Amino acid sequence: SGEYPTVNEIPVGEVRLYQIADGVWSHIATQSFDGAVYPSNGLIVRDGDELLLIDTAWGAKNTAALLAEIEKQIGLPVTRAVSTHFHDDRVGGVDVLRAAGVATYASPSTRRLAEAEGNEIPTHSLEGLSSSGDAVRFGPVELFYPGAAHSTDNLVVYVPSANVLYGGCAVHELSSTSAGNVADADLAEWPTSVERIQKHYPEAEVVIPGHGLPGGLDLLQHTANVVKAHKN
Ligand SMILES: C[C@@H](c1cccc2c(-c3ccc(CS(C)(=O)=O)c(F)c3)c(C(=O)O)[nH]c12)n1cc(CCC2(N)CC2)oc1=O
Numbered sequence: 001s002g003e004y005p006t007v008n009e010i011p012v013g014e015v016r017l018y019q020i021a022d023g024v025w026s027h028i029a030t031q032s033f034d035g036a037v038y039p040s041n042g043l044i045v046r047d048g049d050e051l052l053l054i055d056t057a058w059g060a061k062n063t064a065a066l067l068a069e070i071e072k073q074i075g076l077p078v079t080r081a082v083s084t085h086f087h088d089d090r091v092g093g094v095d096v097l098r099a100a101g102v103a104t105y106a107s108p109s110t111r112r113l114a115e116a117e118g119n120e121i122p123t124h125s126l127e128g129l130s131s132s133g134d135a136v137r138f139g140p141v142e143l144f145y146p147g148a149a150h151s152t153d154n155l156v157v158y159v160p161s162a163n164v165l166y167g168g169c170a171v172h173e174l175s176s177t178s179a180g181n182v183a184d185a186d187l188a189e190w191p192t193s194v195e196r197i198q199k200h201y202p203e204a205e206v207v208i209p210g211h212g213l214p215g216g217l218d219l220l221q222h223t224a225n226v227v228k229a230h231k232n
Pocket residue numbers: 033038087088089150169172173175176177178179180181182183184210211212
């Protein structure tokens with residue numbers, strides 16, 4: 001009823017939207033993995049009379065439910081989606097999107113890693129993001145490659161109209177006690193990559209992590225802190 005929805009508030013298979021700013025929503029879904037249930041976030045950005053989606057809802061059924069929730073709450077068509085790295089919480093559901101008329105995009109590195117790992121593969125490659133500090137425009141957002149962090153391919157998304165920074169899985173929520181799923185992470189480079197984000201987006205007003213509650217710029221420093229302590 002107004003607060004950001006939490007893992008225990010969302011059954012696996014339902015999706016909720018949360019209004020972040022004018023023309024900006026997050027999407028929240030839950031999924032089971034190795035016998036535990038986790039929430040995960042994505043983003044929706046109004047693009048005139050169309051919508052840009054950032055990340056799937058972590059699975060085919062969750063992503064179908066996401067499209068239904070968008071039609072109920074917003075009523076504009078999703079025409080493009082970007083996946084911010086290759087894991088299933090970002091690309092799982094790309095096949096559902098592709099069958100619902102959505103053009104799916106990711107960096108070449110994400111596409112190669114998704115294919116090698118057996119995950120769903122976005123159709124279109126996003127060039128111009130291969131060196132850390134690179135940024136490109138994509139409709140109403142900027143895409144930014146900060147360097148290796150949670151994964152070597154992770155991208156960040158900024159909505160300049162609203163000063164919303166979507167960190168994806170490179171950014172953790174304030175309550176986090178470790179660096180999440182570090183299976184594909186570079187703990188040594190991650191603080192440097194977060195510092196690049198901090199330097200590039202000093203006017204961010206909302207920061208959204210890949211999992212958990214949005215907050216402000218403090219999420220970036222907290223992420224650096226928990227990553228350094230995890231490595232140690
Ligand atoms: C889907 C994702 C995934 C599945 C299940 C859980 C997660 C988390 C996560 C865990 C704990 C917390 C609480 S916390 C920060 O307080 O610890 C959190 F916020 C996020 C994150 C993340 O951290 O992005 N990803 C998750 N996945 C799966 C793999 C396997 C890769 C591989 N080569 C095959 C071995 O690698 C991933 O990433």
